């Protein structure tokens, strides 16, 4: 890929942003599908179309024209995606993770991610939610990456570390919120594989990813935070297990809304 | 993203059923060497894939494409005789086009076939691997034949393909397999694709296998993609037409003859089901 | 797909052989940080990239590369100063150009070096790896510098990569190893390419591990597929400079001597 | 090559008439300066181009164009504030996509204004000129909005333009014009279009007079060649804002220029009652 | 700058060289209305274009067009039924591709036809116009076959136009007019080429004319051009079908194959 | 085409320009063909590759790869184009005239522009130098300009007027200083015309030209000199009639070159600040 946008282009965006609303939040959250009811819990909210936002990749889905929320959550400012990019619909990482780096630029500091994923680890139910430890970039593999191209030092570096990607910390608290919320289920955690979809894994296919030692499977979210790494943001996220995965040839949403909101307090600054 | 319109689609399938009166219900994707199941096909009416409007044409020089639409055991198909690969530079939205139009031509069932190598240890120059399941490599970074807006008179924006090969196809392969009595037994097995078009390393022949692979090739998975897609039954096979090598202390003519012989044999079977394929 | 036509790499090829009268039977791409090989020639002449016809560019500013052409250790060479990459944006096509064209210099041997994470357990930073095998992840996706029609005037249309690195080199590099009496052992092992530019995540490594690579790295096999399709002889070594996270220099001097030295043993 | 595939015209079609109640009979492209035309219009509901399915965005930071329906003065329109040239770097198949979707909402008949510079001697700043016919130099090197291959659906292969600028609302145009009372007389005449954004030279305002032209602008003809592609009617003015430098040797103008403008807007309101069905 | 490269050019002609025995040395372009030609030839062997590696495909829907060699009034020649048009789409180093694939068959004079519409008052519907000279509109906007780096192998950097349209071959064409017993004269002009594919206003034709202008159409000037720069012999002619409008204020089918019949006379006077 | 550099790399390649040498020019000069014997006569000069430029447009014709030189002329400093890019040979206007933005954030002020044209003027003769007192942009009609594109502010307005493009100043000190050298020819004066090219013009095009009010004809400058006036540079340059045009149907360099190089040296005194 040849990032398509150029430096000035997430500044134009940026300051565009900054002289439409006087908010100036410190934590970014992307909402993974059906988890866009999050937007509903923030208060003195003032909402953007991505359509009329400046150099914003505008929503697929018909009838779906995503949102940039800037708002309250649990005392503190937010700006919040309802609606998300992603490479399957035909966007290259450029774009899906455009916004990441707009949000570096109007001050964000912590990128909270959330998505809905297939359940490989057999120990899943439906409705868990596995706080992400780590992730795997099946598509990176290949190339395919929201980096590819000269390397834009006023973001980051060249080739930026990913070990250390989803912080230790909120991971501690992360477990913490979730007991004082008290679940009949634990709090799961794990690796979350990427790769580009539309269609859902086969048998084989799934065992593979297992194997791998993945823990979760979806479409998304791993550019973002190679991104959001990249710039400097701190990250943390969760899967929603929606489904466990077919390995043989034979509500949770609201829980996560609370136990996001509920985090909102662990983040530093 | 595919490149192609919804109306394109319909223009050809408009096109070709304007030009023939056969309505094939079974279209049969074959092979390399297995471009001979074209003879033994009767009342047969050819298009080259170059006079076919939007159809992607062949690149191998001297031998473009063809449409064939014929009578196989009894029952009209459409077969394709000569095929499109990623490694030829054709994105998969192109190497899949004809599967939509046969689709939209009436086709409610696509038989595929193919020539892959041996990952199995039980597999042996000459088998033939009736293919359970599949593995997309390419599938895995973004290469998708469906990626980009879904059209929802195709099918659904997130298909399922757990059951890609059809069961009740598998049952009845077997069964006419052993009707057809032949020394080897019909092996079966998970397919694997990846881009080509250089042949794999030791390492990688290992990787493939530990992935859970019995067979390696370069196309097929695209097509079944589109196929199940857009609601046709599916099932197929891969000839093995060479073993691969999996370690470096291991140190040609017969094995060409293997494959030939193995390649009528296909032929057969896959006539020989055509009265198997329900409706 | 591929870009060029046949007569681009023509083109390219007698621009370079009117430009100097030196005729290398070996190419040598130096890898990160590798690029002191270069100073190791004698008799060298020099071009910029950017000045030569159909020659990828580079993308660091500051680092413009060059191709040098010069005797290293009485054997005569073109070697890479600065090499492409698939994550500086480059399509394969594009990063192996010059692979193509050093076979129509009539170049026979392909050095290819690079520095690489360290993924087999057993090796330590600044040890050398011989590169035995490779996995083109990339490759499993169709990202290939042989994709579109094949130029039959280069190679065939499914070449071999089973055999891609020379097993006569990978002997005389043991014994030459022994030879200099190296207090560390000569490491070999299979390379594995992935897209980069990020490093890896400790799943990936463990992963890739169990794959069954050694080394990891965002080059070099690329140019290995070209040349082999080509019909050059290949081998090459892999500079471990860091050893990847596995849980929650006289080091590249020597490489450039020991690579030196291996000249004498490359046959014709 | 027209980029749009007959269905995204329809998906936008579609989207508008889901999205308002209004059923416009008549389109309006308002001309630079022009945009005032949109006040005055009652029972008004707005769109930003940004939002609409298909739509081209407007370059211009800081203006981001607008569709609007409403009833003018007793016909259903839907008017364009803002515009897409040529210059912008827009191709003819993106600035002429709202034309075509136009037709589709049901619209019958075009009103294209814009603001040109005068080439005819004759011409004073704030004069109005009734197109009676354009020049399209840009098509003269395929430049065109209808190159590739023909829609059926919306028109014929070799669409013919010798009668572009109808001539029944020419003469209601003049008969309106009349009634008004004015004292400046209604000019007419020959519109030529070239790519811009620069302005003309002597040299070029001199040839492009020996032409044939009347007033010089960098818009409105793509729009036209579609208008008259898919049958819709079609009529339209130049507000003449400044008079092109013939010779090598302002608060006036200005003035003449913003008075024009609103006669031009009252004078386009009168005229539709002047349109037929 | 030209999408094909020498090669691909090389490739196409060695297919038609291998797939037909036949050895062209005059390759006759045909117009609106004038792929009747194609008839009234012997030993004919044809190709359809979708077939011949790298040539450009036909947009008209239904009328695949096709190239066919044979022999027309005792010379041997590959002729064009039907055309490309920058209008449908095509950049013009697609629209002129055969041109120079015909120069690399061994063809030595091109022979190009069309349809147009007439300018000069003169003129009326059905009469046939000499090509004397053209007027590139396009081309003065840089739209040009040849832009891009200068193939040496095909023609120079700078070619001359002005002496596109054979002196002789013009004047044998007059000569010849004689026998064909036609009571209207052989009329000769300008052709101006512009893009299309909406016919012209009132401002236009006058315009048009002013320029110098006989004839208009959306075509055959590119061809031409690209004809001359790799060295071509070059004759034409345009059937006017239909008098352009210059102010506000079954006949064709015989038109036709009266062209046909002199372009088949002419065989005899090209050179060689 | 929308033009696909971006403001920022006009800067880069200032930057680097500007941290390669020390030279500031005021002044920037087009070689038109043939006339590249400029750059000699310059002193203290140092020069570029256009390959080795960042951002910078390379040449097309093989072996004559293009040179930047920067150096003195006669008591002024400027820098030089040895090798142009034209339309015809592949490049769109945005990359044609990058150069000349470049020049501008160098802190140019300058631009003189030279070429050889095409005669169309009857009393014009081969080796007449015509100072170009206007211009006919015929690309530029049809929308191939490169200006195209959203405006960059920066650089200069939307609509950039064009009447006054070539210099009335030294237009006037041209003829003056042209006397000084007390030639035999007269210094010439006319629009020039440009045309895409590379083909030369058919009889029905030279008349069709003439009768637009054009003197001389070319495939290059116009492009600059829209550029130029756009980002607010004073310009003048000079057409090298090579060649007188044929406009009868029935009809059947060196030398000006240097003279046009030693007028040009001259004219460096002239030009203000
Ligand atoms: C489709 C959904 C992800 N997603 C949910 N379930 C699955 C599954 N079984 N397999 C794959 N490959 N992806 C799955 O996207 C949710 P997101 O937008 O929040 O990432
Ligand atoms: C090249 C052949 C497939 N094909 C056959 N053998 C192999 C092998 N060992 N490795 C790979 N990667 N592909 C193999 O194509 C046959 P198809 O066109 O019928 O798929
Ligand atoms: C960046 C460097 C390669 N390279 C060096 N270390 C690593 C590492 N840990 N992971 C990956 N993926 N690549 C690594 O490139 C060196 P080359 O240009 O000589 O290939
Ligand atoms: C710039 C303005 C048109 N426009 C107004 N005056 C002129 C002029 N002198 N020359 C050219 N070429 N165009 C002129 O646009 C107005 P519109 O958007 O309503 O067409
Ligand atoms: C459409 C036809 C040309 N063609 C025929 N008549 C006209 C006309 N009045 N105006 C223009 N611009 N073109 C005209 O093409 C015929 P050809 O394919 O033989 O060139
Ligand atoms: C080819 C030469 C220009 N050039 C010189 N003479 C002519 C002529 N008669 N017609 C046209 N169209 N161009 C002509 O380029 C000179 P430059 O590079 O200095 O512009
Ligand atoms: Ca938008
Ligand atoms: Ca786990
Ligand atoms: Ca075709
Ligand atoms: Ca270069
Ligand atoms: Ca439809
Ligand atoms: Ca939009
Ligand atoms: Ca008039
Ligand atoms: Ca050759
Ligand atoms: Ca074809
Ligand atoms: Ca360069």
Redesign the pocket.
Known sequence: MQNGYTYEDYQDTAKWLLSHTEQRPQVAVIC??GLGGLVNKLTQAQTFDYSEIPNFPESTVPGHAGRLVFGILNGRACVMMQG?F?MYEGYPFWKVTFPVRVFRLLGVETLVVT????GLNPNFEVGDIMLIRDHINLPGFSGQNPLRGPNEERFGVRFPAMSDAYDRDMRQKAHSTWKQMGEQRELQEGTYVM?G?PN??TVAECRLLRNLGADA?????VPEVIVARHCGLRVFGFSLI??K?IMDYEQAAQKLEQFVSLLMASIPV
């Open positions: 993974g599908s998300r992603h998505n809905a994923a297939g790769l979809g859902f894994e499977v979806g479409m998304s979210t929606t489904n995965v």
